[PDB]
Amino acid sequence: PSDYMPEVADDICSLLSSGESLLKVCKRPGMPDKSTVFRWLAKHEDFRDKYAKATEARADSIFEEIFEIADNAIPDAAEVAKARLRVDTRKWALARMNPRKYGDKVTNELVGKDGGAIQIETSPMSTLFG
Amino acid sequence: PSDYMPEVADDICSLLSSGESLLKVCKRPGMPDKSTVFRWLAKHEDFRDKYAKATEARADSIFEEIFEIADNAIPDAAEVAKARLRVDTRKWALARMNPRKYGDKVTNELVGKDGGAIQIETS
Amino acid sequence: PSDYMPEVADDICSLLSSGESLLKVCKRPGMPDKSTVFRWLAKHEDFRDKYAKATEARADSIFEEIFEIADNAIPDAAEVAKARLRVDTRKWALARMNPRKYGDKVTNELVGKDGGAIQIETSPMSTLFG
Amino acid sequence: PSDYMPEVADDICSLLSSGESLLKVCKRPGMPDKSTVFRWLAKHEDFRDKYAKATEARADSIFEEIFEIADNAIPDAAEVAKARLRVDTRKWALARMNPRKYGDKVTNELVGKDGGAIQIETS
Amino acid sequence: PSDYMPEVADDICSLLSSGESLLKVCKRPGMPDKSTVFRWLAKHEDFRDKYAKATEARADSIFEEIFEIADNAIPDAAEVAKARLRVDTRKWALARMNPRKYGDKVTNELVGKDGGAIQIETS
Amino acid sequence: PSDYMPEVADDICSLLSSGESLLKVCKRPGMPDKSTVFRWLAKHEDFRDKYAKATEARADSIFEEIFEIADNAIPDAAEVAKARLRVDTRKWALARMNPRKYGDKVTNELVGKDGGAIQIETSPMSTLFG
Amino acid sequence: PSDYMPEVADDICSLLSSGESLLKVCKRPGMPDKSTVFRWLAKHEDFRDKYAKATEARADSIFEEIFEIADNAIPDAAEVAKARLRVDTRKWALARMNPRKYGDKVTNELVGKDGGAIQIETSPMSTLFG
Amino acid sequence: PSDYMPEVADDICSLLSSGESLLKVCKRPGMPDKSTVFRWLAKHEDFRDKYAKATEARADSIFEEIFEIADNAIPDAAEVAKARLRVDTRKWALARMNPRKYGDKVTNELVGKDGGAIQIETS
């Protein structure tokens, strides 16, 4: 399939929403190849918007998936290393798929010199940086 | 079972709050599947909330679980590596389940050049 | 035990204070299971407050414990890896139990361009971000 | 082929936007070599642009590729290490190809001493 | 021995200030156990202080200890891994025992877009 | 060659631009040694300026090179470790060669206490830090 | 030796200045033990001041030492791991000995939303945080 | 040779600027030892300067050296580990020899809650 086909695009969105990766989806019977999918995305805002929703759902599905990949790893050196790579890749991807939900979380307690107030001295510009 | 139904959603929340994973909960007869639970959440704001609170409850259980996974790890190379992966995955997840509680904690002492005041020039 | 029992809750607080993990405590003769303990916490502020104090004490006990886990590790590859995992888990947990005491500590010396003053240029909003 | 030529540059961009690496593109008959493509970019601002957009398109393809590299890794120690290197190199590159999209994501809750207000003294 | 007693607390502090760990100190006859020492600290502010200063003193001893652990490590794989764990645990602990002295040290050169001034818009 | 030779310097710039490292370039027939090259750089602004342009081009060439080093690694423990070291060294170097393009990229969502506004309390100086 | 002995303290400062660790110094013929040295430091400002200068010199000596430890490592798995531990320990220590010189160095290019200006909205306090 | 002497100090600087390490320089006949060179630096501000510039020059040589250490590493496990240590030690050192040039480089896009403006309340 090369021409944009909304029915097919909708199926792609459903499968992605469940956590399946695009390349895996594109290997299913009668699916377009990845390049085609990206071309459809480029030219059809309806698909782009639905794909965005699917990406968010995909992230939530994968968030559950990572526990399973770790917990069920075969206790063999190489298989555990592979499970780790699969989990690490998903962790990294999740933060990009939904930064607000899955990005890193830090609380910074900001203090100044010797645990007192933060000391700031303001001065006139001393060079032309404007 | 795909039609949104309170009570069932109230049941899921209770199951989660008691430490049970969403995966396992949805494997129970009569339970909506994973994708259905999400769809619900998305189209229902009252569920999004009650589920978020169960999520924090669940995180409190997982926090205690990591101690057990580490301490009871089988002292064989691959099993220790697996235990480490299980713990690392949980640590990462906890921060996302309750960021205020389980996020990273840093105290930054902010000083200026040579330990003097922070020097700022403004235009 | 399912109904809230203050005597039992007090014992839990004492054991936790000494550094024992909740799951370990809950395996002792006649203790409630972890789920039960969390339910008690949810519904009884007296217990929640005492549990909070115990958590702080638990953290101080574990802070001493980590040196022992490292120092006494059996010099065998897998046992050292296990000791490391046990220590790493405690280090991570301690920062969450008492962030002010056990969180990371950084001193940031803040300087500007070429080691001079920090250069700031303020402008009127150029878009509606209010 | 060293003289700057649009259309050819438009072709390169299309090839990139479809997932193909610059290396491979330049290995095609009639294609300028790597160094020539750059020289072009430098001395032509309209090309710098159209190529940057193809670069973002390419990054979107690579993003999906990392899932496959990880999931289909051969379960042998060296092959898993190689897969990890291929994935790590792509993750690092993606952040540079489209920083807004693939850069690191952090939420910093900024508080002051003991969780109170941030205390500042100014001269 | 559970009742708070100065002099004994003054003794503990001295023992700590000389490099001895709290664990070892409490293993001495007549010494309160670990939990008792804490309880004291909590309900006595004058002890919390004198103990904090001994803690900084102890950290200064541990700082020198890490050099020895590393340099004298037995050149066998597991023993080196153990030495590394002992050193890493001490490095982490030192930062918490005296944050001003043993915390991480970073100098951040703060600049704006393209190395120009930091651009701020305010409402 | 010890005396500054613009023809030779130009060749150095071309080779570097293509991604070759300076030490490798300096091992080619009739090239100056690295020390000589650095001396030329110190004393000739024409060369320094051209070398700066070459460094930027060198970085773009290496950015393509790293995929190849990873993808073509021999699946043998030591060779993969070597490929990793070669890639890691290039990644680190690229950020120094062109910081704006190849430095780390982070988006920081800045919030305050409990996810509300960032709370700032300003006070008069309480010590002489001016 | 238990009583403070300036001659001995001066020697300690010289040896430390050259890069030797305190515990190693204290194992030399006729040197005080580490505990004694720390007690002397606590009670004698003259020694404390000279020790501070020695610490700075010690750091500069170690900074040269780390290249040698790495470069001369025996190419055996365990010996290389030991060399790494020795170097890593020194790197960490150097930043504490002289934070200004040996601390981490970062240049942060600060930009705002979409690479434009940093957008700040100021509001009246909405809670009593003063 | 312990008495401060210009010309000799000018020679050291030249030796350093040409890539030679201080260790090696001081191993040359007639050269002051390591400790003497420092003492000089401390009690002479004009030397501190000329030496700092040689240090930056030296760093530029080491920068190129890391490429060679990595690329020419012997493909045996321990030798690759050693090469990695040699490279890592140099990377760390470079940042301290010339922080402006070889320090870490980060671009931080600073935004507020939900990607809106950064919200600040002041007292």
Side-chain angles (χ1 to χ4, degrees), chain C residues 16 22 34 56-57 68-69 74 78 83-84 90 111:
Chain C
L16 285 171
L22 186 60
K34 80 153 178 63
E56 178 179 359
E68 191 161 4
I69 295 168
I74 298 171
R84 184 186 162 199
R90 282 156 172 81
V111 305

Side-chain angles (χ1 to χ4, degrees), chain B residues 37-48:
Chain B
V37 178
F38 298 146
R39 209 184 58 189
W40 287 8
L41 291 173
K43 64 170 187 167
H44 298 270
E45 183 182 328
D46 175 36
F47 190 37
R48 279 205 297 258

Side-chain angles (χ1 to χ4, degrees), chain F residues 75-130:
Chain F
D76 164 73
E79 294 279 3
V80 175
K82 177 175 175 168
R84 184 186 162 199
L85 175 63
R86 289 178 70 207
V87 167
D88 289 346
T89 301
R90 282 156 172 81
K91 291 186 316 186
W92 184 91
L94 262 41
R96 273 92 183 145
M97 296 175 175
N98 187 342
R100 220 154 57 192
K101 187 161 180 186
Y102 296 120
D104 286 352
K105 313 291 187 194
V106 183
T107 298
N108 294 271
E109 172 187 30
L110 304 184
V111 305
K113 181 62 171 293
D114 295 326
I118 298 165
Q119 295 176 159
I120 301 179
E121 181 169 1
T122 55
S123 286
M125 48 196 300
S126 63
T127 64
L128 284 162
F129 61 68

